[PDB]
Amino acid sequence: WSWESYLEEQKAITAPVSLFQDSQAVTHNKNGFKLGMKLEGIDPQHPSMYFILTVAEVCGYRLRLHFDGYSECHDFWVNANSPDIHPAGWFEKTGHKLQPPKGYKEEEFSWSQYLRSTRAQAAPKHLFVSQSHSPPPLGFQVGMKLEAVDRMNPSLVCVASVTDVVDSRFLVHFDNWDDTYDYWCDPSSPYIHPVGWCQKQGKPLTPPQDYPDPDNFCWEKYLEETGASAVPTWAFKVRPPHSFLVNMKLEAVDRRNPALIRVASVEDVEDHRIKIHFDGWSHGYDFWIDADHPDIHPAGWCSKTGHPLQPPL
Template identity: 65%
Template sequence: MTAQTTVSMLAGSYSSVQLILSVFLVSVKRRSWSWQQFLNQQQAEAAPVALFTQSQSFPSRRSAFKVGMKLEGVDPLHPSMICVLTVAEAIGIRLRLHIDGYSECYDFWVNADSAEIRPAGWCKDNNHKLHPPKGHSETDFDWTDYLRSSGSQAAPPTLFTCRTAVSVRPSSCGFRVGMKLEAVDRKNPGLVCVASVTDVIDDHFLVHFDNWDDTYDYWCDNSSPYIHPVGWCEEQGRPLTAPQGHPNPENFLWEEYLQETGSTAAPTSAFKLRAPHGFQVNQKLEAVDRRNPMLIRVATVTDTEDYRVKIHYDGWSQQFDVWCDSDLSDLHPVGWCQRTGHPLEPPPGSSPLPSPSQGVCPTAGCRGVGHIKGAKYTGHHRSVRRGAQASPRCPGLSVSVDPNTDGHRVSPPTVQTLGQETPAFKAAVLCSDVWCHHITEEIIRTYISIFCQIIFIFAESSESSLQAALHQSVFLSAMSAQPGRDLSLCWEQHRKLLPGVVGETAETVQHWSVQQVANFVETLPGCEEQSKLFRDEQIDGRAFLLLTQQDIVRILSIKLGPALKIYNSILMFKHAKDRNEDVFEGRTVRRRRRTAELSQ
């Protein structure tokens, strides 16, 4: 057995014990928890099933989707794009979908009856553009060839609840591609902007803000409270935001704009505003965790507006409450999880959970889902396609923040993006954000120390001493706030092993191009071949700094040895600024002391 294999086995065994213990305790907790008892204890009532829409309520049939099946669906980050997808995970009727050709950090969750997924070949049959996997040509992509080459199967059309034969006729919803309207910017809700209909599927259509990119687009139907006919702002006495680059935005006139663009306004009769919802404060329901969407939690309605509700996750601080649309498909009636076979997360504190001393996350109620188990789907992982803001809450530590394109309107942070800081250690061991200020120098040094000890053990020690040192460095040092006394020496030795990191900081690395990242990886000893992977995956400087060791090993399929070197380089880049400041301050002190000695 090699030393490298021993490292993997020991670390894997320890993590497995932690995971098994956590899963066992959680399963016991779930079996002993019931909605009826909880409602009685809280003297609360469940939200009536009649308040939920068809997409929120109990499904009419079970999902028959299987892992590995391929399909087509809307990219949630770019709603105008329909992509090739693969079912990566199926829990109850919920599916985790993977965008073929891209990192799994872009995976997303939908219900099996979602209107935003379609069978393979739907785009071709309905004259829609399909975005093929990376490396495939849009003009030459063929589903039959792709399924054959990938050894996979397409999800049968019978599994989909959408109408698949033809696209909806314009008269069904009253909107046609090219029509103009006024629409609320969902990412800046205080603004009503000039918008166009750019796509129509069944009874839904795509709202696009004129002269802005597609990250602000959204799908809706004609009952949406966020869309209004041309002239609505003038009638309501509200300002209308003109298209970006309009020559006279302060004096925008619809008549002139429609004539200039050769377009027509959507007819007023097409707008069918739905009635306000009937949810009431203190009603209970089941809700997807917006910060870690693989989880569904016990929740309470704590505030309401005509078309929105404020959701509180029972057992958690109010700072994690979120406002969402009342018809959001992530809200479900009490008993939905049990009916569909999906795990329900009971409120933390309703039964004993592992304590921090047992090696799990120190945040009460967290069992590690989102970082230990590697759930990188709008969870702890940071995606370069989406802005992220550190959150003190463990399950789904990354609070996803909708990105603002350069030059676009920026609104104050919403309630979903605000939070208070927790102790640095909690965030540091879970947070991988490039600029996360929770990552303290002591923690960075601890991980550097662990890596250094292992490197030198490989070179100088027997396997018996390796196991002993691993126990001390991995299982003890990582839990200690004080790194080893020989850390400074180890740091300098490690800088010599990785000369490419000298003089570089995260501030400069984040601006590296894909080629610069590949060139750097190539300079690392034994990583010449791995540099090609970074070039093929188009990993630039910012994406490079966001990588975790697990990403490097599992997603990029890089062996442990090179992965450790690459990941340790990333840590050293992040720590370089503080380290340089320490050195500068140390030299300044020594100069002052020397000057004082000479003057005496």
Template identity: 60%
Template structure:
């Protein structure tokens, strides 16, 4: 009877809440561009704003011709957007219209990223092996032992069909004039004011991988011959722009292209290889649809706020100017009006005035609905400003998600200038190196840090030296403590065992002040002398009882009971049938 009453009350409460929510929706004023309950009409919106949509001809690939055939769970190979020189094993984690979220196998969801189904950066399984590219296997696998057939069988998954990929060939044979190892001058995409010495480090179809000499590979990027960010050798001198040389040069005045080409045994890319495209023709006030850079699963109604060279400044309609950002005019993240409707993707409408006030239920940030998280796709929502990607304190933070491959700087060594393999234009493997020459200051962006290989034989001499130093210190401490113990023994024949409070205090200090590095090198012994101070009394007791191997069950229990804090465990040793000294 009580259960029936409770269920009836729950139904009544649910009905009341539903009616209240429906009443709030009806009371909410309907915007002129709304269609139905929550639909959005571009025609009504453009008519209301007296604006025009960006012409379809301004977009590189305006509308897809085919449907998105990728399914969740399909596996493939693709380029890591944060490390463009890496080809990784990926899985489809989510699909929305013509877009999909890709996941790095073996890594957390924080590093997932969204791409269009016709992206040129994804390839079918086995593409790397066929085209002589190194595939980075999932975490925990070795490149030499990874096999697609066994991996798909073990993970009980399927590879994405080849006919779903827009990049049908992906050949390393480049039809343009660029060749592997050629030099050029390229713009740093993370700092467009810098033009630096660069090298063609990889080729796919008509695209080249731009690598900045002496920089980490995470700054690399793919470009085609029409890109406005790559220039022939001598472009900076001709246009009066400052050229940033490799970081081994003290200043740009010391750098000479002739000397650098001779030292690296390389050649300059011919001027005919560069075919810079004109700007697309966007104008201020044009409307379009754009991917939200803070929550990349969303696409919002947007306006071109400004135009500069080959970039456009985007502002989400209804949002403050603090949320404006720059993108390339050929970016795959900008689309003509109607793209979401045609591909089946949800379009976020303009921010209404009623939403600029903080929501008492969800995230208090104005305009935020609690979607997304500053720690990436591992969390799909949030309810506070601390984790809100739109919160003012989080807008300019670029490193909220830790790098997938690079860890703490203290555990990494600097990437060097060009290795001997790169100088001979083999360009294989990682670009490990040393630091700049002594007395020379680095120029340009500092390189990132790479993990130190502690298993290398070159680290053994240093590790052995540290072991000898530690052993000498340990020996001095042992002698000093032994002398002190002998003096105490001479003054008193008997000494009570340490109390439980003393042991607990010592354990607390051992945890918070252990006397050694919390993360010591694997080749160095622990500094254990401090932990053995209170063992001297028990070692004497053990010596008086004889060899512990020959102890009986009663002798083992007696010894355990004498240890502070272990009195209750002594009974367990007495009741056990096999608790002799040998087992102990």
């Protein structure tokens, strides 16, 4: 419809561009991904693992990725500036493991030969914002230890490790646990803390799954025993709370059908999260989201990138 006339009739304002990360706001980059191009990327359900992916669909600045050899029911959407996708050949050049297409074996797979056999085009390197050609996030080296909130069970702060580093980001892993609980972040993340923070704050720390003698959990000796260092405290930066206010309007991907983006409103706020309401829909579909999530955008993003915008219902 038009944002302009909507704002007049509702007597409302949009969340200003300045409130968003540059990466959530940028509209002027073209999407150079094309149908059938091949690449590598993380599995959103197993964020430590990398698979061969194909571009199955492009919509504006977004793309839908298919896991080669597997079912289309696993396909998922990302933005073209996603740091979670990488060019063909990246895994080998940066020390990562590639899970091959269904029916291959890790060491059976070669990009040269795969491309010959498929006659497919690898997505060109220059498309990717993350190629491990930037120097890491200061002070966060693989194997180092920290305390982290289990984003799945937010009342728990837990023994955790850095297991992956890529450009300005690193992977937080829970000791003795599935990669299912892992998550990517950067040194300003509000979900991470230096070794000792729990003790110094009052809260209990959850030790590694099936550790010997859990209440008697000692960090400086866990550390000596694992040949690990804790991430230095000077490394952990303070992300300031976001400045979104209740009733500001924006555009947000609909988690019920991620192909769609909708007119939305800020229904509530915490320091680092906002509660999203889709205008014209039930408050039952209202949901909490991290302010820095890739799937929230300023008003006009859809229009400038060429993605349909769902008007209010």
